[PDB]
């Protein structure tokens with residue numbers, strides 16, 4: 001609601017080459033494959049709305065990524081990755097239009113190796129916020145976000161195998177205790193298995209500050225799959241924490257759309273976020289799940 | 302019982318056809334994947350291009366559409382600058398001075414196909430912008446710029462036809478309200494529009510796919526696809542000159558993706574040659590793209606005046 005978060009140990013905006021100067025934002029977390037670092041980016045012209053594609057970028061230098069020409073691209077917004085049963089699960093939002101107007105959107109899921117991803121399922125109509133994680137016992141955890149009916153409710157369910165991911169499973173997910181989130185809307189960008197067996201969630205939450213301001217903040221919480229309880233909900237980042245950048249339009253002046261965290265050698269983490277729907281940056285923050293266990297999941301493909 | 306009405310015409314075509322040449326296209330830069338069910342070739346900025354459906358031979362419904370630049374005779378390579386499209390069966394047309402690009406976007410549920418619709422993009426060939434989808438489970442939607450500057454739309458429910466003023470006006474509602482064309486020439490064949498051309502007469506030259514299920518005495522069931530053409534009067538919805546113009550056996554040999562596709566040619570369209578004949582491009586056996594050199598199929602109804610010179 002009104003927290004008192006406004007310590008950062010460093011910050012940067014990433015540079016992206018090979019996309020004709022287009023904006024790149026709302027990225028996946030970085031991942032490794034075959035001795036290199038990669039990231040998926042949402043690529044869009046600054047002056048175009050709902051004209052995104054998701055592109056695979058290879059890290060080529062400090063804070064610098066270049067489109068990898070071998071990879072196919074995906075007709076998707078807000079790409080994301082996770083490791084399930086030793087392979088990549090990749091997703092994003094596929095937008096349908098009717099005569100230029102958005103009419104539908106759904107999450108599309110791919111699995112395989114990073115240069116050989118195969119489409120296997122979509123989530124339900126008008127559900128953007130779906131994230132997967134491998135649980136300690138090898139089941140697959142699924143976070144869902146029920147947004148269509150004016151409500152903003154988060155669900156959680158499990159499946160045994162990734163090709164069991166269906167509309168029916170997602171739609172029937174049991175609701176989590178959402179009372180910690182208050183009037184915020186959103187959900188996880190990246191979910192992590194912790195050494196405790198709990199799940200560390202790095203999430204995006206939106207608020208109207210009261211005419212209103214739209215705020216999109218980087219948040220975290222810890223989730224217990226055994227009880228459906230939520231712990232330690234907090235704000236961990238805002239757009240003002242990142243280096244300045246002119247937002248895509250003025251109404252996005254307080255918009256950070258989180259990507260996720262990466263652990264550092266020094267025990268702190270890089271919090272990656274889309275900012276202003278124009279850029280990707282990171283801030284260096286304290287480990288947000290401190291006391292609930294260390295991250296044991298990885299994106300080392 | 303009720304053998305498809307098209308079988309006699311298919312058999313007669315195989316007896317009576319005139320083929321002046323043939324080739325299978327070669328594709329570089331897709332890791333040995335199959336490339337089939339292409340767009341027609343087009344030109345842009347002094348080069349020749351074609352969009353291809355790219356899929357591993359032993360994978361079903363795992364396609365992407367890739368832009369290929371022409372390297373040499375019958376040879377194309379993936380153009381690395383282009384984005385790729387998560388689509389089957391890509392196609393192009395020129396409308397109001399720009400490219401309209403389309404293909405089929407497949408939705409799955411737990412690995413199983415649950416839906417598919419045509420997605421449309423517009424712009425220049427390396428800068429295509431998504432603007433609309435057709436209705437659920439309608440693959441074969443084709444556009445053409447009419448003699449009067451309106452946009453003609455062919456639909457498949459039975460083939461329908463309707464018009465719009467500007468490409469942004471292409472909606473599910475417009476497509477679903479299309480009036481049915483004269484069905485009587487087509488009989489009981491399954492089929493759909495492929496590339497549509499404006500003719501100098503103001504009529505439309507339509508390249509189409511038509512086919513049927515064939516049970517074989519001892520053999521397995523084939524899904525025949527043949528390359529067909531007809532001429533269409535947009536004022537009356539009348540169809541002229543419906544005929545077969547290509548079959549898989551006309552093209553160079555290629556082992557089909559699965560045995561039921563041993564007589565599947567899924568047409569792409571025609572390209573005029575300097576000698577007044579045409580290259581008929583087709584997907585063959587869902588594994589390759591080829592062309593056969595044929596007589597101009599709209600002979601007597603006017604010259605093609607539409608273009609894909611972008």
Ligand SMILES: OC[C@H]1O[C@@H](O[C@H]2[C@@H](O)[C@H](O)[C@@H](CO)O[C@@H]2O)[C@@H](O)[C@@H](O)[C@@H]1O
Nearest residue numbers: 026050077078095102105128255257277
């Ligand atoms: O713009 C802030 C925030 O809003 C949501 O997406 C918007 C836009 O990015 C997207 O093209 C359309 C259609 O899907 O929806 C929203 O207008 C978020 O999901 C996120 O993308 C964005 O940062």
Ligand SMILES: OC[C@H]1O[C@@H](O[C@H]2[C@@H](O)[C@H](O)[C@@H](CO)O[C@@H]2O)[C@@H](O)[C@@H](O)[C@@H]1O
Nearest residue numbers: 338362389390405407417440565567587
């Ligand atoms: O396979 C013959 C012919 O059939 C249709 O497509 C098939 C297949 O290629 C496609 O992946 C799926 C899902 O759309 O549908 C059909 O099984 C045609 O549309 C054409 O693509 C193909 O040559």
